[PDB]
């Protein structure tokens, strides 16, 4: 019966809320009030990477911490040489509309995708020395928003059809399909162990999914608007989510309840991308205000402003060694802050 | 200094820059339009997931992008089309019941933050069906739009070559509704060119060409005069 199902769902939600309230023994702010805050973290544009002739929509840092990708609206996926700013490669995309760009952990393949609903994996280490579409995964009914390389052969992708798909590059088939989201999924990050991943949806909900089990484990709410980006903590027991409300949030997996919130009351623009430092002390995030704020994850206090761009900021990322904070903006220029 | 490998890499980067600039110059001439409308409208049959069509008039090339399948809320993917030259909007003017839904959709697409600088083209479609319906008189627009009862055609407007008074009144009422929804906001950098077209009309892409020319001229004048 529909009424019985609704009553059961309401009872389960009430029980979950009561358990979360009971588990809220203390608060992160009170505990961290005894620690010494960092003072006025300032950064400068060490290297500026240009060449793109249209807006930049995505970026990924290579495992080597020296090469990074950038996808534009002009159907160009450029692999740079940040240490020297040389353009290592420039792949002309089949479709000019690309919304994501992922670099393989081994530096062998690069994944791109946008409104085409097709994830194109290009192989870089070709015998002929050229770059070509290694594979083209299809099956999503909506635009592909976020995608990451789980492994050299397994790739997990998120689309606008409210579902996520773990494919197989060798077989080009949907190994697993995860559904349940009531809105478009726009965020996806891979955990350090590459076993669990959190995806945010337009319904202001972040769902944790297991690569093997492939079943939802926890659902985190609290945001008043759509979620645009999510990133894991370096430890792996917590993550952060950014929405259009102009305030970031930090949740803990084990606690299952919201831990921290980050806002200043002087910021009204939405968050486009967030990232974590090597030690996880920082909460670098972007805004439509043409700047990035160095949010303090453990103190929820602003440190500095990387005001260098002229337009919106789309992508933000931090190298594995925590030595580069390269970001990208719609001005068609990347910038490496340090 | 820089070793031989570094110099070769720099030369490769310069060559890549040359190729990119050549491609950009080649692709900058064309103009990108975003085709929007409802299922009832005649979106596809206007100019003689993604579905892009290319057509050239007067030595000017237009790429019309017809993103489809992403119904309901257009957000999270309209942001891509924040640089297009115009949103070719198509609405079936014959259906009175669906007119209010079309007006709501136009309101949503007109006040959107990321589209606060592009000018739509209304392309009131299916003229013949509306003319036949109004001539028959079986369906009354006043049922769904009571204001139309007190509405009279403007006295300074130019009547069509042979349009009847009732058809002209209905056409002008629809156009006035859409234009009024257009002018409630966006004081500058916003226009709602309301062309009125029939199901078959060879001189159709010409209207898009003229309106794109006007939009470009207006933005150029705005830039020149603002400073």
């Amino acid at each position, epitope marked *: 019966e529909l009424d019985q199902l609704r009553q059961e769902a309401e009872q389960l939600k009430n029980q979950i809320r009561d358990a979360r309230k009971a588990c809220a023994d203390a608060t992160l702010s009170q505990i961290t009030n005894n620690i010494d805050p960092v003072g006025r973290i300032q950064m400068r544009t060490r290297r500026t990477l240009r060449g793109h002739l249209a807006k930049i929509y995505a970026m990924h840092w290579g495992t080597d911490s020296r090469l990074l990708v950038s996808a534009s609206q002009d159907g160009k996926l450029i692999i740079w040489d940040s240490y020297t700013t040389n353009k290592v490669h420039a792949i002309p995309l089949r479709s000019s509309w690309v919304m994501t760009c992922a670099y393989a952990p081994s530096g062998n393949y690069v994944a791109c995708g946008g409104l085409d609903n097709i994830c194109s994996i290009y192989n870089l280490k070709t*015998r*002929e*020395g050229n770059v070509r579409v290694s594979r083209e995964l299809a099956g999503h009914t909506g635009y592909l928003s976020c995608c990451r390389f789980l492994d050299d052969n397994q790739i997990v992708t998120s689309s606008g059809d409210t579902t996520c798909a773990l494919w197989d590059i060798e077989t080009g088939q949907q190994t697993t399909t995860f559904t349940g989201h009531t809105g478009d999924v726009m965020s996806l990050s891979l955990a350090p162990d590459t076993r669990l991943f959190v995806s945010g949806a337009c319904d202001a909900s972040a769902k944790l999914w297991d690569v093997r089990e492939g079943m939802c484990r926890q659902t985190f709410t609290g945001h008043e608007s759509d979620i645009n980006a999510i990133c894991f903590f370096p430890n792996g027991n917590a993550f952060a989510t950014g929405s259009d409300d102009a305030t970031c949030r930090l949740f803990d997996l084990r606690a299952d309840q919201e831990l921290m919130t980050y806002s200043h009351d002087n910021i009204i623009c939405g968050i486009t991308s967030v990232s974590f430092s090597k030690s996880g002390r920082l909460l670098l995030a972007g805004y439509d205000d043409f700047n990035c704020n160095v949010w303090d994850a453990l103190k929820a206090d602003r440190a500095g402003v990387l005001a260098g761009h002229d337009n919106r900021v789309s992508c933000l990322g931090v190298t594995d060694d925590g030595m580069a904070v390269a970001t990208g903006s719609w001005d068609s220029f990347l910038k490496i802050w340090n | 200094t820089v*070793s031989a*490998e570094d110099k*070769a*890499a720099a*030369e490769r980067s310069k060559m890549i820059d040359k190729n990119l600039r050549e491609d950009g110059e080649k692709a900058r001439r064309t103009l990108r339009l975003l085709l929007l409308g409802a299922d009832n409208s005649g979106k596809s049959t206007i100019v003689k997931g993604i579905f892009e069509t290319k057509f050239q008039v007067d030595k000017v090339n237009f790429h019309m992008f017809d993103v489809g399948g992403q119904r309901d809320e257009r957000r999270k993917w309209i942001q891509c089309f924040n640089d297009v030259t115009a949103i070719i909007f198509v609405v079936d003017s014959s259906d009175y019941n669906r007119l209010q839904e079309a007006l709501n959709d136009f309101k949503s697409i007109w006040n959107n933050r990321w589209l606060r600088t592009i000018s739509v083209i209304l392309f009131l479609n299916k003229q013949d069906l509306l003319a036949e319906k109004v001539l028959a008189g079986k369906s009354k627009i006043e049922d769904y739009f009571p204001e139309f009862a007190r509405y009279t055609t403007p006295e300074d407007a130019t009547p069509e070559p042979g349009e009847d008074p009732r058809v002209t009144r209905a056409k002008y009422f629809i156009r006035k509704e859409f234009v009024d929804i257009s002018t409630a906001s966006g004081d500058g950098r916003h226009i709602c060119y309301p062309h009125f077209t029939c199901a078959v009309d060879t001189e159709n892409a010409r209207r898009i060409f003229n309106d794109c020319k006007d939009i470009i001229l207006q933005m150029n004048l705005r830039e020149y005069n603002l400073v």
Partner: single-chain antibody
Amino acid sequence: VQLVESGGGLVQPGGSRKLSCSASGFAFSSFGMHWVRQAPEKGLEWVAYISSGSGTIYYADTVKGRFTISRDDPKNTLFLQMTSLRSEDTAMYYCVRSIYYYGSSPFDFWGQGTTLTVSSGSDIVMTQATSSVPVTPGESVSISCRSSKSLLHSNGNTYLYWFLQRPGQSPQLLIYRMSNLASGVPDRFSGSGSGTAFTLTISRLEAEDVGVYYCMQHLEYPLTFGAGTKLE
């Protein structure tokens, strides 16, 4: 991948000749070309190099104003024009394709070699002391190559290339940059260095793994090859 060189033959002293080299199976226009000269008795010796797009052209100090290198990308061909050939020019010429970028493998492929018979300062002095190191299959062997200059730029990259030329075959790249192994070669080969002396170590030998080992430097032109060590 395929590089076929032709045009060689018998040329009298003081004459002129043209050597053609056709490339297929890969993007020739994106790969720089090198002409490697191997004497009947001496080892490999760089002659000329042309970068992608013909922007940069380098010639060996031995041949100046006589050897011209050109490339035709639409025809995917490489031409070497030699004028006023002398006795010393008698040697075998090989085409080598190299692509320069971060993580690349220069000198990945070599040509089959075309013979040519003629009737009748401030340069690295890399020397290979080893001349003959007979071994037995199943054992481990070591080869040492010394350089007169520190082949370690400030960037931290050691510009060394170890090549192997088995009998009846053209030279094949084994190791590039002294750290990364070539593509397709077995993992047994191991390169090590300290900035002045470099060593190749093979844990297990094989019938196919036999020939002449050459050490070359790419720190700065002109390229200089080692004396060459032959196993047995």
